[PDB]
Design an enzyme around this catalytic site. Structure first.
Site, PDB file in Angstrom:
ATOM      1  N   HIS A  28      35.962  40.998  38.948  1.00  0.00           N
ATOM      2  CA  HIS A  28      35.862  41.952  37.814  1.00  0.00           C
ATOM      3  C   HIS A  28      35.657  43.335  38.354  1.00  0.00           C
ATOM      4  CE1 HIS A  28      35.629  38.654  34.988  1.00  0.00           C
ATOM      5  NE2 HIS A  28      35.059  38.014  36.052  1.00  0.00           N
ATOM      6  N   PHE A  86      21.915  37.164  31.990  1.00  0.00           N
ATOM      7  CA  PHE A  86      23.238  37.314  32.522  1.00  0.00           C
ATOM      8  C   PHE A  86      23.878  38.648  32.183  1.00  0.00           C
ATOM      9  CE2 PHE A  86      27.813  35.365  32.109  1.00  0.00           C
ATOM     10  CZ  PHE A  86      28.207  36.066  33.263  1.00  0.00           C
ATOM     11  N   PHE A 123      31.584  44.150  30.066  1.00  0.00           N
ATOM     12  CA  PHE A 123      30.258  43.622  29.997  1.00  0.00           C
ATOM     13  C   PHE A 123      29.334  44.537  30.716  1.00  0.00           C
ATOM     14  CE2 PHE A 123      29.971  41.628  34.310  1.00  0.00           C
ATOM     15  CZ  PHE A 123      31.330  41.549  34.650  1.00  0.00           C
ATOM     16  N   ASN A 154      37.887  39.814  31.861  1.00  0.00           N
ATOM     17  CA  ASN A 154      39.299  39.560  31.990  1.00  0.00           C
ATOM     18  C   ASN A 154      39.599  38.088  31.773  1.00  0.00           C
ATOM     19  OD1 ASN A 154      39.010  38.161  34.517  1.00  0.00           O
ATOM     20  ND2 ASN A 154      38.670  40.161  35.498  1.00  0.00           N
ATOM     21  N   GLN A 180      28.508  41.096  26.505  1.00  0.00           N
ATOM     22  CA  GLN A 180      29.973  41.257  26.532  1.00  0.00           C
ATOM     23  C   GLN A 180      30.440  41.768  25.182  1.00  0.00           C
ATOM     24  OE1 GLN A 180      32.128  37.677  27.462  1.00  0.00           O
ATOM     25  NE2 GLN A 180      34.160  38.655  27.180  1.00  0.00           N
ATOM     26  N   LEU A 197      30.453  37.457  40.559  1.00  0.00           N
ATOM     27  CA  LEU A 197      31.559  38.187  39.902  1.00  0.00           C
ATOM     28  C   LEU A 197      32.290  39.169  40.807  1.00  0.00           C
ATOM     29  CD1 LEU A 197      30.039  38.653  36.364  1.00  0.00           C
ATOM     30  CD2 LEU A 197      31.470  36.818  37.230  1.00  0.00           C
ATOM     31  N   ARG A 204      29.463  38.169  22.663  1.00  0.00           N
ATOM     32  CA  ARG A 204      28.969  37.108  23.579  1.00  0.00           C
ATOM     33  C   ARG A 204      27.881  37.740  24.380  1.00  0.00           C
ATOM     34  NH1 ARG A 204      30.901  35.453  28.790  1.00  0.00           N
ATOM     35  NH2 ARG A 204      30.317  33.274  29.274  1.00  0.00           N
TER      36      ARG A 204
END
Lengths: 11, 170
Positions: free
Chosen positions: B132, B66, B119, B108, B69, B128, B61
């Protein structure tokens, strides 16, 4: 949206 | 010292270069130890029966502007992954925030569900923070990151497969 999940990717 | 680990990446099977990551053992040792061990494969096999090892796994991903991942070495699609401690482990500390491109953080499925997915931020991601656990940063090969980022899309689907062809500890 912009999350980093592991199995249910949400908004 | 803080550990340094690497990924030798391929994109569509073609070598893309090496990402080197410094791991904040000083700040979040339990989280760092998991990631370090998953780069060497030393701890054996998980509950999945797959090697506890990033080698051969993919960035499944990738979302431009951004993050990238990866780390799902058990199902390849975001629905798997597991830690050297068992399927999931607690959020250790939120002492570092997602302040810049190259920050390395745990993916997660809500509080206290860390496995193996991670990531690399390609922008600051303050939304975030607190959700995370940040545990390291890219120190070389950020270009490789940005080249992977371009293969991504808004859906997270990659145009060509992005594989950790080799990995380990320096």
């Amino acid at each position: 949206x912009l999350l980093v999940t592991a199995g249910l990717v949400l908004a | 010292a803080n550990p340094r680990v690497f990924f030798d990446m391929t994109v569509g099977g073609a070598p893309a270069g090496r990402i080197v990551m410094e791991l904040y053992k000083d700040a979040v040792p339990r989280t760092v130890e998991n990631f370090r061990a998953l780069c060497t494969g030393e701890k054996g096999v998980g509950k999945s029966g797959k090697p506890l090892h990033y080698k051969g796994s993919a960035f499944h991903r990738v979302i431009p502007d951004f993050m990238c991942q990866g780390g799902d070495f058990t199902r390849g699609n975001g629905t798997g992954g597991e830690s050297i401690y068992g399927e999931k482990f607690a959020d250790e500390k939120f002492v570092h925030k997602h302040t810049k491109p190259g920050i390395l953080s745990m993916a997660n499925a809500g509080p206290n569900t860390n496995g193996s997915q991670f990531f690399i931020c390609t922008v600051p991601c303050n939304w975030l923070d607190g959700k995370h656990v940040v545990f390291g940063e890219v120190v070389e090969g950020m270009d490789v990151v940005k080249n992977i980022e371009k293969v991504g899309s808004r859906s997270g689907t990659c145009s060509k497969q992005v594989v950790i062809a080799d990995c380990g500890q320096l």
